[PDB]
Amino acid sequence: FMAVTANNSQLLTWWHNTGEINTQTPVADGNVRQSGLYSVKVQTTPASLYYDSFVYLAIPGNGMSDQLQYTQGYNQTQAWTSFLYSHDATVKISRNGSNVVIRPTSLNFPVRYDNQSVYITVPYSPTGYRFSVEFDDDLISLAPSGARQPENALLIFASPFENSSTKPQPGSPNSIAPAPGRVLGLNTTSASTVVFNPGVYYFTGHDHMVLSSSVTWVYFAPGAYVKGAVEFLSTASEVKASGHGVLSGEQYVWYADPDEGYQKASGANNNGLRMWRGTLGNSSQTFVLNGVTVSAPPFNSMDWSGNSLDLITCRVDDYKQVGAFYGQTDGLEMYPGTILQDVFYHTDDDGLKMYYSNVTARNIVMWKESVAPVVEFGWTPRNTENVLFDNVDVIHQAYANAGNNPGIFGAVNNYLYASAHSTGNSNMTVRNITWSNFRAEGSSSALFRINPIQNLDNISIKNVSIESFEPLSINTTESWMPVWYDLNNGKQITVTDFSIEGFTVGNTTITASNAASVGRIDGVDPAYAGSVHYID
Ligand SMILES: *[C@@H]1O[C@H](CO)[C@@H](O)[C@H](O)[C@H]1NC(C)=O
Ligand SMILES: *[C@@H]1O[C@H](CO)[C@@H](O)[C@H](O)[C@H]1NC(C)=O
Ligand SMILES: *[C@@H]1O[C@H](CO)[C@@H](O)[C@H](O)[C@H]1NC(C)=O
Ligand SMILES: *[C@@H]1O[C@H](CO)[C@@H](O)[C@H](O)[C@H]1NC(C)=O
Ligand SMILES: *[C@@H]1O[C@H](CO)[C@@H](O)[C@H](O)[C@H]1NC(C)=O
Ligand SMILES: *[C@@H]1O[C@H](CO)[C@@H](O)[C@H](O)[C@H]1NC(C)=O
Ligand SMILES: *[C@@H]1O[C@H](CO)[C@@H](O)[C@H](O)[C@H]1NC(C)=O
Ligand SMILES: *[C@@H]1O[C@H](CO)[C@@H](O)[C@H](O)[C@H]1NC(C)=O
């Protein structure tokens, strides 16, 4: 076996010669964990060469069996492949040894079969696609929900070619290109651009990619696999991470604290290593994040340093988070003004963190694991306004109990304190929030579980479809919204103009009269019953 990879104007695929098939221990430092189950090839249409595409594999604990306690305890693994394209292509999947379902199910790609292979015709789109290929005979039941999911997931990331804004042109100035292996000196380099060409790089579990203050761009080539985590020291007007390679946190222990020797943090200090971190002075910065796959975060995926987060905005496109089997593996922060689109999230904690104003997020595919809501706007009261989240397909959920804080639209209790609902702020308001075209495939948690820790005004749910609910038994499916009060003066928190439209469960539209019985919306406090409107 030697692989043949495409590199033409229509298709680009890649391989790694240090691929290691391994499902229980850490791979060698210079090796890349490879699926032993799935083999993928790609061929531009029409059908008259098939080129090999590397199938990466992430596993719970990353081979560190002593870290499995910090996962949900399932035996699921997650394989994925990426390729670049500019024309319709056929993806050919073979198994080392049944019909498939493609999620999101709205995609409707043609699927064909022969003796030993599955063929998926992926049409070209300028924003690409991110999807799951789910073999019927590989599905298992995840207790206690009974959610039916791949034991061995295969994710397909078809992306458009890289242009001069996401790939440094050849002959680019002041660029450094580290050689494969241990990467050193990037924290003190005078380069402005760091280029990771195809190959394997690592920082070990006791270091990370601290980028010097002159670095404004890190590029992960397709075929580059980097073991590490990114921290920009530059306070410049733009910092950029781009390219279609992988940044993998697999060498870090869960909750690794870079200020305590990268050992597991002492007592939940929230100083766990982020996959993306940046630094602000007293002027504006834009974080551009494009193309990259992040795998196996040891903690929250991202946070910027400083106490002046209005100065940061994000522009995120064609980005993936995979193999996030650990707890507290949050999605990105979306700072004020952020535009985020065409993203894949595997997450076992808060997915879409609606913490900041003037944000637009669209075309998101989410594999929610077992903890935290899809959308989060609790923890701390905020002034937050003018948000659109549109076209979010939650292709799986696997909650277990109420303590997981389940739900599509959630705002959990106040973090500084957890009588129960009396630490709100009546002086703060969340306004003009639109959540539109959400799909929950398979069994789902509740539509919403919202603590109004500050006032709510003009919140619109428009088109949300739930295929089915998780069992009543596990207390994850009833929606609620209890009355809250102000911390200092006991003034009641208000909820105003909260509308629900186009909400279905199965093929049944939810109205005022069946909201409780069919939609399981049975916990709206009487104080807010007049503020919640069913348009139908
Ligand atoms: C594909 O070819 C381009 C030059 O056209 C080169 O920059 C790139 O590294 C190649 N990619 C792979 C995966 O071989
Ligand atoms: C993995 O766990 C599932 C339960 O979710 C079980 O059905 C399946 O047999 C397991 N596979 C093993 C132990 O290989
Ligand atoms: C740069 O990083 C290395 C580890 O990669 C660290 O030992 C060194 O102290 C750092 N240099 C500075 C000036 O912080
Ligand atoms: C968001 O934009 C609105 C007006 O469109 C403005 O009033 C407000 O200051 C902005 N908020 C933030 C945090 O940028
Ligand atoms: C309300 O939110 C939308 C985004 O959904 C934004 O376009 C609009 O400007 C916001 N309204 C106001 C008055 O700022
Ligand atoms: C809200 O403002 C009032 C004064 O108008 C103040 O008494 C109260 O402490 C504030 N609430 C909070 C939670 O800080
Ligand atoms: C909701 O779905 C309907 C039917 O597909 C569509 O016409 C409408 O535009 C959608 N609403 C929004 C706000 O996108
Ligand atoms: C579900 O909720 C009720 C109310 O708190 C409780 O009595 C029950 O034990 C909970 N757990 C279940 C049914 O597993």
XYZ file of C-alpha atoms and ligand atoms in Angstrom:
648
model
C 0.000 0.000 0.000
C 1.125 3.457 -1.018
C -1.396 6.294 -1.151
C -2.150 8.411 -4.209
C -3.309 11.901 -3.276
C -4.845 14.574 -5.512
C -3.309 18.025 -5.945
C -4.975 19.610 -8.966
C -7.238 22.563 -9.778
C -10.311 20.523 -8.848
C -9.331 18.436 -5.819
C -6.721 18.250 -3.076
C -6.349 15.350 -0.653
C -3.492 14.330 1.626
C -1.902 11.554 3.590
C 0.486 11.083 6.460
C 3.229 8.478 6.353
C 3.382 8.359 10.178
C -0.249 7.308 10.460
C -0.739 5.037 13.439
C -3.747 2.726 13.872
C -4.249 2.783 17.635
C -7.465 2.825 19.714
C -6.235 2.778 23.325
C -2.886 4.470 23.993
C -1.277 7.727 22.964
C 0.256 7.668 19.521
C 3.967 8.406 19.197
C 4.905 12.096 19.190
C 5.610 12.160 15.432
C 2.623 9.947 14.575
C -0.970 10.737 13.627
C -3.830 8.563 14.886
C -5.564 6.981 11.903
C -8.887 5.205 11.487
C -8.483 1.447 11.096
C -12.180 1.117 10.273
C -12.794 3.691 7.533
C -10.945 4.252 4.280
C -11.990 7.208 2.103
C -11.160 8.123 -1.492
C -12.379 11.084 -3.568
C -12.972 11.447 -7.327
C -14.040 14.574 -9.219
C -17.168 14.031 -11.332
C -17.745 12.625 -13.887
C -16.655 9.083 -12.938
C -13.817 8.479 -15.451
C -9.138 8.581 -10.563
C -9.984 7.869 -6.947
C -7.527 9.652 -4.637
C -6.825 8.658 -1.036
C -7.909 11.047 1.741
C -6.495 10.584 5.245
C -8.986 9.487 7.890
C -7.968 10.951 11.257
C -9.251 9.410 14.518
C -9.930 10.941 17.924
C -10.715 8.819 20.979
C -12.026 9.555 24.496
C -9.067 10.311 26.769
C -6.704 10.514 23.742
C -5.210 7.173 24.788
C -4.745 8.309 28.404
C -6.955 5.763 30.128
C -6.541 7.593 33.493
C -8.373 10.613 31.940
C -11.509 8.662 31.022
C -13.061 9.655 34.361
C -13.290 13.179 32.852
C -15.410 12.022 29.880
C -19.025 10.797 29.786
C -17.852 7.151 29.899
C -19.120 6.185 26.449
C -17.075 4.090 23.988
C -17.766 6.268 20.959
C -14.855 7.314 18.753
C -14.813 10.021 16.094
C -13.106 9.691 12.702
C -12.994 12.440 10.092
C -11.512 13.427 6.754
C -10.952 16.741 5.000
C -10.303 17.598 1.365
C -10.431 20.755 -0.744
C -12.508 20.906 -3.885
C -13.814 23.248 -6.581
C -16.043 20.819 -8.519
C -18.613 18.142 -7.641
C -16.849 15.108 -6.215
C -17.753 11.570 -5.292
C -16.695 10.418 -1.820
C -16.005 6.688 -1.704
C -16.086 5.084 1.745
C -14.918 1.547 2.492
C -14.939 -0.364 5.764
C -12.322 -2.792 6.980
C -14.526 -5.866 7.514
C -25.159 -1.700 5.572
C -26.887 1.513 4.465
C -25.929 4.998 5.711
C -27.720 8.081 6.956
C -26.183 11.466 6.213
C -26.604 14.156 8.865
C -27.718 16.901 8.510
C -30.549 14.967 6.800
C -31.583 18.054 4.828
C -28.486 17.606 2.638
C -30.023 14.841 0.450
C -26.780 13.924 -1.311
C -27.248 10.984 -3.690
C -25.928 7.742 -2.192
C -25.040 4.585 -4.119
C -23.568 1.197 -3.231
C -21.603 -1.664 -4.761
C -20.143 -4.907 -3.337
C -17.836 -3.273 -0.758
C -18.299 0.552 -0.856
C -20.583 3.537 -0.318
C -20.547 6.421 -2.816
C -21.733 9.904 -1.872
C -22.027 12.587 -4.496
C -20.983 15.810 -2.786
C -21.929 18.790 -4.910
C -19.592 21.755 -4.911
C -20.544 24.702 -2.767
C -18.396 27.782 -2.200
C -18.847 27.402 1.604
C -18.321 23.627 1.536
C -20.048 21.031 3.707
C -19.540 19.382 7.085
C -21.479 16.163 7.686
C -21.718 12.816 9.435
C -21.929 9.443 7.655
C -23.772 7.024 9.914
C -23.850 3.295 9.184
C -26.995 1.555 10.320
C -25.110 -1.491 11.676
C -22.655 0.697 13.645
C -25.371 2.463 15.656
C -25.510 1.887 19.418
C -27.839 3.002 22.219
C -26.457 5.535 24.671
C -27.852 5.110 28.192
C -29.972 6.582 29.745
C -31.435 8.508 26.780
C -31.389 5.555 24.365
C -30.085 7.937 21.690
C -29.114 5.947 18.571
C -25.656 7.041 17.356
C -22.552 5.723 15.589
C -20.221 3.882 17.914
C -17.573 4.922 15.351
C -18.398 8.282 13.764
C -17.114 9.345 10.339
C -17.206 13.085 9.581
C -16.671 14.495 6.093
C -15.326 18.047 5.766
C -15.487 19.174 2.119
C -14.015 22.691 1.863
C -13.366 25.202 -0.915
C -9.811 26.008 -2.053
C -7.738 28.444 -0.066
C -7.343 32.005 -1.436
C -4.629 34.589 -0.706
C -6.461 35.778 2.436
C -6.363 32.280 4.081
C -3.141 30.886 2.516
C 0.127 32.866 2.478
C 1.103 33.218 -1.161
C 4.378 31.531 -2.060
C 7.224 34.018 -1.566
C 5.415 35.642 1.385
C 7.479 38.068 3.538
C 8.835 37.589 7.070
C 7.556 34.007 7.319
C 8.904 31.137 9.362
C 8.222 27.515 8.471
C 9.188 25.142 11.310
C 10.414 21.646 10.392
C 8.428 18.570 11.493
C 8.812 17.491 15.134
C 9.208 19.527 18.312
C 8.476 23.203 17.477
C 10.649 25.779 19.300
C 11.263 29.553 19.299
C 7.883 30.779 18.029
C 7.377 32.768 21.283
C 10.481 34.892 20.580
C 10.523 34.926 16.752
C 10.423 38.209 14.787
C 8.405 36.578 11.991
C 4.927 37.938 11.419
C 3.650 34.773 9.717
C 4.093 31.130 10.807
C 3.607 28.459 8.137
C 2.980 24.791 8.918
C 3.538 22.851 5.679
C 2.393 19.227 5.374
C 3.871 17.087 8.166
C 3.548 16.438 11.887
C 4.463 18.933 14.615
C 4.157 18.793 18.388
C 4.641 20.950 21.459
C 4.351 18.106 24.024
C 1.947 18.174 26.951
C 4.205 20.678 28.807
C 4.377 23.562 26.340
C 2.143 25.314 23.785
C 2.313 27.564 20.744
C 2.841 30.885 22.469
C 3.279 33.132 19.422
C 5.514 36.225 19.730
C 3.973 39.701 19.578
C 5.060 40.097 15.949
C 3.099 36.996 14.815
C -0.191 38.096 13.265
C -0.848 34.959 11.177
C -0.507 31.214 11.812
C -1.295 28.930 8.862
C -2.079 25.225 9.056
C -1.618 23.727 5.609
C -3.875 20.938 4.506
C -1.824 17.868 5.445
C -0.290 19.659 8.420
C -1.069 18.085 11.789
C -0.001 20.149 14.797
C -0.192 18.900 18.382
C -0.554 21.989 20.537
C -2.633 25.062 21.415
C -2.471 28.644 20.190
C -1.862 31.813 22.204
C -1.262 35.071 20.298
C 0.795 37.695 22.170
C 0.210 40.246 19.355
C -2.078 43.148 20.260
C -2.266 44.143 16.558
C -5.456 45.060 14.716
C -5.698 41.530 13.247
C -4.585 38.083 14.380
C -5.320 35.182 12.063
C -5.391 31.388 12.223
C -6.211 29.754 8.894
C -5.661 26.817 6.562
C -7.247 23.349 6.622
C -4.759 21.466 8.779
C -5.392 20.159 12.285
C -4.560 21.705 15.655
C -4.856 18.825 18.158
C -4.878 19.159 21.959
C -4.387 15.386 22.460
C -1.093 15.631 24.392
C -2.644 17.770 27.165
C -4.285 16.268 30.227
C -7.860 17.422 30.909
C -7.991 20.894 32.458
C -4.213 21.305 31.923
C -3.081 24.565 33.545
C -0.212 26.239 31.676
C 0.569 28.339 34.782
C 0.978 25.169 36.936
C 3.340 23.097 34.746
C 0.464 21.957 32.494
C -0.771 19.738 35.297
C -4.490 19.379 35.915
C -5.699 22.631 37.534
C -5.967 22.774 41.341
C -9.655 23.062 42.226
C -11.574 24.354 39.181
C -9.751 27.715 38.715
C -10.954 28.105 35.059
C -7.298 28.447 33.953
C -7.380 25.355 31.764
C -5.468 25.612 28.495
C -7.483 27.114 25.629
C -6.988 26.001 22.025
C -7.294 29.646 20.934
C -6.154 32.560 23.089
C -5.162 36.123 22.207
C -4.007 39.305 23.875
C -5.423 42.843 23.810
C -3.804 46.223 24.384
C -6.096 49.268 24.424
C -7.063 49.202 20.722
C -9.304 47.103 18.452
C -8.536 43.576 17.291
C -10.180 41.140 14.894
C -9.544 37.398 15.247
C -9.902 35.733 11.853
C -10.355 31.964 12.109
C -10.832 30.044 8.892
C -10.575 26.455 7.668
C -8.870 24.938 10.699
C -9.934 21.692 12.373
C -9.410 21.633 16.143
C -9.322 18.208 17.767
C -9.336 17.067 21.379
C -9.467 20.319 23.346
C -8.409 19.775 26.976
C -10.789 22.503 28.208
C -12.826 25.493 26.910
C -11.848 25.990 23.263
C -11.191 29.745 23.431
C -10.903 32.912 25.492
C -9.090 36.247 24.998
C -7.048 37.710 27.877
C -7.641 41.091 29.482
C -10.684 42.809 30.938
C -11.650 44.846 27.882
C -13.404 42.332 25.622
C -15.343 44.982 23.663
C -12.098 45.568 21.735
C -12.207 42.055 20.188
C -14.377 40.779 17.341
C -14.253 37.411 15.527
C -14.663 36.367 11.904
C -15.068 32.611 11.805
C -15.693 30.477 8.707
C -15.256 26.849 7.633
C -14.092 25.807 11.132
C -14.456 22.461 12.925
C -14.135 21.135 16.477
C -13.929 17.340 16.714
C -13.074 14.674 19.291
C -14.095 16.841 22.223
C -14.991 13.942 24.542
C -13.883 15.820 27.670
C -16.158 17.854 29.866
C -16.105 21.662 29.635
C -15.141 21.616 25.950
C -17.120 24.786 25.105
C -17.496 26.312 21.665
C -15.781 29.573 20.683
C -16.450 32.918 22.319
C -18.308 35.196 19.899
C -17.184 38.652 20.923
C -19.079 41.829 19.931
C -19.631 42.219 16.184
C -18.677 38.599 15.458
C -19.740 36.932 12.256
C -19.446 33.153 12.435
C -20.585 30.778 9.744
C -20.160 27.298 8.305
C -18.915 25.636 11.485
C -18.974 22.077 12.899
C -19.048 21.675 16.689
C -18.569 18.481 18.656
C -18.984 19.716 22.222
C -19.650 18.358 25.694
C -20.429 21.813 27.151
C -21.928 25.232 26.210
C -22.148 25.278 22.417
C -23.209 28.710 21.162
C -22.314 31.163 23.901
C -24.627 34.131 23.413
C -22.631 36.419 25.717
C -22.061 39.490 23.477
C -23.974 42.045 21.381
C -24.227 42.486 17.602
C -23.378 38.872 16.765
C -24.403 36.786 13.741
C -23.927 32.998 13.639
C -25.203 30.836 10.816
C -24.886 27.450 9.124
C -23.754 25.452 12.127
C -23.775 21.670 12.489
C -23.594 20.598 16.145
C -22.989 17.192 17.724
C -23.993 17.959 21.309
C -22.774 15.372 23.764
C -24.240 15.113 27.296
C -23.775 18.477 29.080
C -24.992 22.081 28.776
C -27.445 23.670 26.381
C -26.956 24.118 22.651
C -27.346 27.860 23.168
C -26.243 29.397 26.487
C -27.012 32.846 27.909
C -26.933 32.236 31.681
C -24.110 32.125 34.279
C -23.858 35.930 34.601
C -26.357 38.700 33.919
C -25.530 40.800 30.868
C -26.559 43.628 28.642
C -26.680 41.795 25.312
C -28.518 42.940 22.195
C -28.998 42.309 18.464
C -28.184 38.640 17.891
C -29.094 36.302 15.039
C -28.435 32.550 15.203
C -29.754 30.966 12.012
C -29.656 27.532 10.462
C -28.313 25.359 13.240
C -28.668 21.605 12.891
C -28.137 19.749 16.143
C -27.586 16.352 14.576
C -27.270 14.501 17.908
C -27.837 14.971 21.625
C -27.107 12.510 24.469
C -28.191 14.052 27.772
C -28.743 11.952 30.944
C -30.363 14.144 33.633
C -31.560 17.604 34.692
C -28.183 18.243 36.347
C -26.631 18.289 32.862
C -28.475 21.602 32.156
C -29.976 20.294 28.926
C -31.998 22.167 26.363
C -31.723 23.857 23.010
C -32.141 27.348 24.442
C -30.678 27.548 27.924
C -29.632 30.099 30.528
C -28.298 28.408 33.647
C -28.191 29.804 37.190
C -25.835 32.585 38.383
C -22.214 31.273 38.623
C -21.187 33.288 41.727
C -23.951 31.562 43.786
C -24.842 28.276 41.995
C -32.996 31.241 48.076
C -32.667 29.988 44.502
C -33.851 32.582 41.970
C -33.021 35.853 43.721
C -29.586 36.884 42.378
C -30.657 38.536 39.134
C -30.017 42.075 37.944
C -33.117 44.125 37.116
C -30.865 46.864 35.639
C -29.670 44.679 32.725
C -31.513 43.488 29.613
C -31.072 40.987 26.793
C -32.862 42.393 23.686
C -33.501 41.591 20.054
C -32.511 37.953 19.911
C -33.558 35.873 16.911
C -33.035 32.095 16.910
C -34.191 30.782 13.548
C -34.240 27.554 11.566
C -32.944 25.207 14.272
C -33.232 21.449 13.649
C -32.825 18.753 16.285
C -32.397 15.303 14.768
C -32.996 12.126 16.728
C -34.230 12.449 20.297
C -33.934 15.905 21.794
C -33.828 17.735 25.079
C -36.255 20.535 25.968
C -36.933 23.501 23.693
C -35.863 25.818 26.484
C -34.731 26.003 30.098
C -34.211 29.670 30.791
C -33.415 31.401 34.039
C -34.024 35.126 33.402
C -31.040 36.364 35.427
C -31.614 39.731 33.757
C -34.625 41.114 31.898
C -35.596 39.596 28.515
C -37.144 41.752 25.771
C -37.951 40.844 22.140
C -36.743 37.242 21.818
C -38.013 35.355 18.752
C -37.882 31.627 18.078
C -38.681 31.049 14.398
C -38.730 27.545 12.897
C -37.422 24.943 15.298
C -38.091 21.301 14.522
C -37.633 18.500 17.009
C -37.852 15.036 15.525
C -38.567 13.355 18.890
C -38.048 13.854 22.616
C -35.750 11.984 24.943
C -37.598 9.822 27.480
C -39.780 11.721 29.997
C -38.101 9.500 32.567
C -34.737 11.363 32.503
C -36.065 14.904 33.233
C -34.412 16.623 30.273
C -37.344 17.427 27.980
C -39.684 19.801 29.821
C -39.183 23.485 29.039
C -39.335 26.053 31.837
C -38.819 29.700 32.721
C -39.215 30.520 36.441
C -39.654 33.994 37.893
C -36.423 35.650 39.095
C -35.660 38.672 41.290
C -32.938 41.301 41.698
C -29.958 40.537 43.985
C -29.983 43.887 45.804
C -33.500 45.411 45.727
C -35.805 42.391 45.096
C -37.388 43.897 41.984
C -38.902 41.195 39.741
C -37.047 40.354 36.517
C -39.265 40.960 33.470
C -39.691 38.940 30.291
C -41.403 40.759 27.446
C -42.291 39.885 23.853
C -41.031 36.275 23.844
C -42.455 34.631 20.717
C -42.453 31.041 19.433
C -43.284 30.362 15.778
C -42.845 27.326 13.530
C -42.109 24.954 16.424
C -42.834 21.320 15.494
C -42.436 18.024 17.322
C -42.717 15.145 14.869
C -44.992 16.667 12.232
C -47.158 18.527 14.768
C -47.098 22.302 15.015
C -47.049 23.633 18.560
C -49.725 26.161 19.548
C -50.816 27.650 22.872
C -53.266 24.754 23.397
C -50.797 21.855 22.883
C -47.619 23.626 24.078
C -47.644 21.637 27.338
C -48.851 18.230 26.161
C -47.032 17.964 22.807
C -44.171 20.502 23.115
C -43.567 19.741 26.818
C -43.518 23.457 27.555
C -45.081 23.103 31.003
C -42.886 25.293 33.225
C -43.494 28.883 32.176
C -43.982 30.756 35.457
C -47.435 32.383 35.771
C -45.606 35.733 36.037
C -44.441 35.308 32.412
C -47.386 33.451 30.859
C -48.689 36.693 29.313
C -45.247 37.426 27.812
C -44.913 34.147 25.881
C -46.744 34.175 22.560
C -47.491 31.293 20.262
C -47.833 32.631 16.713
C -48.521 29.041 15.503
C -0.075 20.932 -3.515
O 0.687 21.693 -4.435
C 0.928 23.013 -3.982
C 1.575 23.833 -5.095
O 0.705 23.905 -6.207
C 1.777 22.983 -2.705
O 1.906 24.298 -2.218
C 1.111 22.119 -1.633
O 1.923 21.952 -0.475
C 0.696 20.764 -2.204
N -0.141 20.075 -1.235
C 0.010 18.782 -0.936
C -0.928 18.198 0.084
O 0.873 18.070 -1.451
C -20.078 0.173 23.310
O -21.136 0.557 24.169
C -22.450 0.271 23.729
C -23.445 0.867 24.718
O -23.634 2.238 24.417
C -22.649 -1.231 23.559
O -23.919 -1.481 22.990
C -21.564 -1.777 22.640
O -21.623 -3.185 22.598
C -20.182 -1.339 23.125
N -19.127 -1.871 22.276
C -18.100 -2.608 22.724
C -17.983 -2.922 24.192
O -17.238 -3.033 21.959
C 9.738 30.616 25.057
O 9.206 29.304 25.180
C 10.071 28.357 25.774
C 9.452 26.965 25.709
O 9.118 26.643 24.378
C 10.314 28.788 27.213
O 11.139 27.843 27.844
C 10.997 30.152 27.199
O 11.201 30.608 28.513
C 10.143 31.161 26.437
N 10.878 32.417 26.322
C 10.445 33.558 26.868
C 11.304 34.778 26.678
O 9.398 33.659 27.518
C -24.205 46.970 19.381
O -24.697 47.855 18.384
C -25.664 48.763 18.885
C -26.339 49.559 17.773
O -26.476 48.786 16.609
C -24.992 49.721 19.864
O -25.990 50.544 20.434
C -24.244 48.965 20.962
O -23.330 49.828 21.602
C -23.440 47.785 20.420
N -22.969 46.991 21.546
C -21.730 46.494 21.585
C -21.332 45.709 22.806
O -20.927 46.643 20.665
C -31.858 43.414 15.801
O -31.148 42.258 15.390
C -30.883 42.160 14.006
C -30.089 40.867 13.831
O -31.005 39.803 13.921
C -30.144 43.391 13.488
O -30.065 43.324 12.088
C -30.920 44.652 13.837
O -30.213 45.806 13.447
C -31.181 44.694 15.332
N -32.047 45.804 15.636
C -31.608 46.996 16.028
C -32.671 48.020 16.285
O -30.426 47.294 16.193
C -29.892 48.156 40.221
O -29.918 49.556 40.386
C -30.416 49.984 41.642
C -30.446 51.505 41.665
O -31.283 51.957 40.622
C -29.550 49.461 42.782
O -30.199 49.715 44.005
C -29.332 47.957 42.663
O -28.357 47.566 43.607
C -28.947 47.528 41.243
N -29.003 46.075 41.126
C -27.923 45.292 41.087
C -28.160 43.814 40.980
O -26.762 45.714 41.139
C -39.577 29.326 8.355
O -39.812 28.287 7.429
C -40.703 28.685 6.404
C -41.118 27.459 5.611
O -39.930 26.840 5.187
C -40.026 29.745 5.541
O -40.923 30.193 4.564
C -39.691 30.937 6.422
O -38.956 31.900 5.701
C -38.891 30.481 7.634
N -38.738 31.604 8.530
C -37.581 32.244 8.705
C -37.580 33.398 9.663
O -36.541 31.919 8.130
C -37.119 13.702 37.980
O -37.718 14.800 38.650
C -38.499 14.561 39.804
C -38.783 15.937 40.413
O -37.649 16.473 41.062
C -37.858 13.590 40.809
O -38.832 13.218 41.756
C -37.299 12.357 40.086
O -36.642 11.449 40.952
C -36.345 12.863 39.004
N -35.481 11.834 38.420
C -35.830 10.771 37.686
C -37.274 10.482 37.350
O -34.957 10.003 37.271
